[PDB]
Design a protein around this ligand. Structure first.
Ligand SMILES: Nc1ncnc2c1ncn2[C@@H]1O[C@@H]2COP(=O)(O)O[C@H]2[C@H]1O
Ligand SMILES: Nc1ncnc2c1ncn2[C@@H]1O[C@@H]2COP(=O)(O)O[C@H]2[C@H]1O
Lengths: 202, 202
């Protein structure tokens, strides 16, 4: 029973998107705000040749498309792709600005998300500047093995993730991931010849 | 410049002076206060595990600082903020600012516009660190420095004043590596250097 949210949503139009669909294309002019009613999405950027990196996952209760709201004529800063089937609310910036005047609390909620995103994204900068691709992948595997969904393994922790997915986390090709996983395995730090990846130590 | 809404806000603030190099905000402090730069500029810094500093952003006259803890009590400052020139900085408790928002939400709109711009800029830096080689990282850094308020017009582009150390802290390289790359960009006729002065070609 969140009256402000239900009220906000009643001014949106809501649509279903299947997994893998693209909600937002980078470079499109930004005139509308989104809100995830159900599902999860990936926010992605690309280099000149199409190599992808994930800036963030966003989930139920997250706003999307907010970055052009405060100045007209801006473009979308990233792609947003559905990672699961999603239900996503959309509203024009013009209408949302009307809602803000009615109850500023809806803006407070959006701004709280933007603040968190800046904190999380700033933490990434430190890592990318200081580590090379091997160090980025190594750090990523340790980070994944410390998440709640990591599984225990007699030898440490076990994670399930594709070379493609790791590549999207660090901004490199699935091939480069493959080469580096083999090197870490030869350094006795992980086992990947299995199905999942085992990260040695807890 | 200024308007009555900013002056209204400022009349609720205490204004304090900070000499160059003095630290306004230390990482880890309890966040309870919002700042606004009335005059001067600052650097926002974070550190690597080894304690080496990185420059995350510059901020200038008209920028809010210390905003990231406003939306949820109990948070810590996410970075250090240090005066780059002599500074005059307005300050107000989060509690009093949240009262002002309820009186006139436009002051929150102004803060949120800067948070959105910061997320765009920091996300672009994440892509640059992830994707570009060290040479390209530095070349893009010089282009970005040329957009700062203190950069000066020049026949062939913009003129900036910056040290090997500062560039290194922005891209995460040694002063040695920066020097070597600057010499290359100069040979590639992308810039011209003179002591600590650099002309960045358009
Ligand atoms: N670093 C980030 N963290 C979380 N989401 C982001 C980040 N960068 C971009 N986005 C989201 O991706 C959206 C792309 O379109 P917009 O720029 O309009 O709004 C953007 C944000 O909703
Ligand atoms: N990525 C960033 N870009 C611009 N300013 C930042 C960035 N990260 C942190 N800051 C600023 O540094 C301040 C540190 O204190 P706060 O976390 O309260 O608020 C932070 C922001 O004002």
């Amino acid at each position: 029973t969140d009256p402000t949210l239900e009220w906000f949503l009643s001014h949106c139009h809501i649509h279903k998107y299947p997994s893998k669909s693209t909600l937002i294309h980078q470079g499109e002019k930004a005139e509308t705000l989104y809100y995830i009613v159900k599902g999860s999405v990936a926010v992605l950027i690309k280099d000149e040749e199409g190599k992808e990196m994930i800036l963030s996952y966003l989930n139920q209760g997250d706003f999307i498309g907010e970055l052009g709201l405060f100045e007209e004529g801006q473009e979308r800063s990233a792609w947003v792709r559905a990672k699961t089937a999603c239900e996503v609310a959309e509203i024009s910036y013009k209408k949302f600005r009307q809602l803000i005047q009615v109850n500023p609390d809806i803006l407070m909620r959006l701004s709280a998300q933007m603040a968190r995103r800046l904190q999380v994204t700033s933490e990434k900068v430190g890592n990318l500047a200081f580590l090379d691709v091997t160090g980025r992948i190594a750090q990523t595997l340790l980070n994944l093995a410390k998440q709640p969904d990591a599984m225990t393994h007699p030898d440490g922790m076990q994670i399930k993730i594709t070379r493609q997915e790791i590549g999207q986390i660090v901004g490199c090709s699935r091939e480069t991931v493959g080469r580096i996983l083999k090197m870490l395995e030869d350094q006795n730090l992980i086992s990947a010849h299995g199905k999942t990846i085992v990260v040695y130590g807890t």
